[PDB]
């Protein structure tokens, strides 16, 4: 649908455009921290909590959002967004991976 396509493109822009509204802490900080520091369950749960809040803050079309860190990508930070949009009966899952600079739609 035209709706599911525009939300996805604009999410991608939030994670990659260098002058995103999303806090820099969440776009680049956390990935660059995980390369130099041992992983911590409290930091990872923190990251998902605030990333979820920031996306809800900056994408009014999302009605529900769950943010999880994907396990199998141990070599780099990988994020799974489970979105529900207003006025669309069907969940949208968007998977993002950090590598070579920014984020990529898997």
């Amino acid at each position: 649908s035209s709706l599911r396509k525009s939300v996805c493109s604009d999410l991608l822009t939030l994670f990659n455009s260098p002058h995103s509204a999303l806090p820099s802490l969440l776009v680049s900080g956390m990935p660059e921290w995980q390369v130099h520091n041992p992983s911590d369950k409290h930091l990872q749960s923190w990251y998902c909590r605030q990333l979820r809040s920031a996306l809800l803050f900056h994408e009014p079309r999302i009605a529900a959002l769950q943010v999880n860190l994907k396990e199998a990508y141990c070599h780099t930070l990988a994020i799974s967004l489970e979105i529900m949009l207003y006025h669309d009966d069907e969940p949208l899952t968007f998977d993002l991976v950090w590598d070579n600079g920014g984020w990529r739609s898997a």
């Binding site: 509204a21 660059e32 921290w33 909590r49 809040s53 809800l56 803050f57 009014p60 207003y86």
Partner: protein, 332 residues
């Protein structure tokens, strides 16, 4: 008002944000103490131990992490919520090591919308503050629909009571579910009151959870609104808009048919708004049938324009798919 008897230390160098935080916590019933910076905060902690301190990281004279490490190194278990514009992950890691409720992140503009984030962050601890048993804290409620439901039933108002010089009576007229149509009525002062009716069957488990959260925060949301106007002129549609953002931020998706009402016993004004519920109001003047089939949780912006009707005594049938109740009010 779930924070009555509790002390909040608000540490904030920016006057606009400090006044916002002051209003939010005062409206929930807390005693708020204000500090301009980290040294002022530390000096004030010399006299009392709050149930919560809120502070940023960057601020004059002493930063938030040095203040946190200072009170932790001294032995205090004081709950600390951090709200920061930092860009340094080392700050985050240091705060979480030291022990915080959370580190929330700020936006550039629009500090108003942090309210839902803050309340949704803190609401577990508010529910648990009345659990004073880890089979009965908030998480056990989230993970046990049966326990959640029966606690909600246990909290329904009595069928007959006196609120703000008004006799208020209600009665469930159908039994569609375990809890079905739920109700809460509260004084706002000695002369006015407010109430809401929520159908908890449209979102299932999230509906019960929404009802427990709304019972704790509904009064405070109205108090915050009345506090910023000279004449007590409630705007119930602004309440619906805020409740919708609150449930969204609290991760409670679904459909929430919700009717809100307000009544002033001297002015004789009854104000109603309905998102997703039907109502039939009978007074001496007219019979008034209100309907709206669009519940909360289905629109980004849940604002609606309210109805108002002067009257001395009234009765109101409210129904949705979840059931039907009759609410009655007359002068005491």
């Amino acid at each position: 008002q779930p924070l009555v008897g509790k002390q909040i230390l608000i540490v904030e160098d920016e006057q606009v944000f400090r006044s916002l935080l002051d209003s939010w916590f005062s409206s929930l019933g807390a005693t708020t103490v204000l500090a301009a910076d980290g040294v002022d905060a530390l000096e004030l902690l010399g006299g009392f131990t709050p149930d919560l301190m809120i502070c940023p990281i960057a601020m004059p004279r002493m930063n938030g992490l040095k203040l946190l490490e200072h009170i932790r190194n001294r032995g205090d278990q004081t709950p600390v919520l951090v709200i920061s514009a930092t860009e340094n992950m080392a700050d985050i890691a240091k705060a979480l090591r030291l022990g915080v409720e959370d580190v929330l992140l700020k936006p550039v503009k629009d500090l108003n919308r942090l309210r839902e984030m803050v309340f949704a962050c803190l609401y577990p601890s508010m529910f648990n503050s009345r659990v004073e048993r880890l089979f009965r804290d908030w998480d056990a409620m989230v993970d046990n629909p049966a326990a959640a439901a029966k606690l909600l039933q246990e909290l329904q108002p009595p069928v007959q009571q006196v609120i703000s010089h008004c006799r208020v009576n209600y009665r469930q007229l159908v039994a569609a579910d375990k809890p079905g149509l739920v109700l809460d009525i509260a004084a706002l002062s000695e002369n006015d009151l407010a109430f809401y009716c929520l159908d908890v069957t449209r979102a299932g488990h999230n509906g019960v959870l929404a009802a427990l959260l709304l019972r704790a925060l509904f009064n405070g949301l109205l108090q915050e609104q009345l506090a910023h106007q000279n004449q007590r002129l409630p705007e119930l549609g602004a309440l619906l808009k805020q409740v919708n953002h609150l449930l969204r931020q609290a991760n409670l998706p679904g459909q929430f048919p919700l009717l809100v009402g307000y009544y002033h016993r001297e002015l004789k004004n009854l104000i109603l708004v309905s998102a997703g519920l039907n109502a039939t109001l009978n007074t001496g003047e007219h019979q008034v049938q209100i309907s709206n089939g669009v519940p909360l949780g289905t629109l980004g912006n849940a604002y609606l324009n309210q109805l108002s009707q002067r009257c001395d005594a009234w009765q109101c049938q409210i129904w949705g798919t979840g059931g039907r109740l009759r609410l009655m009010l007359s002068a005491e």
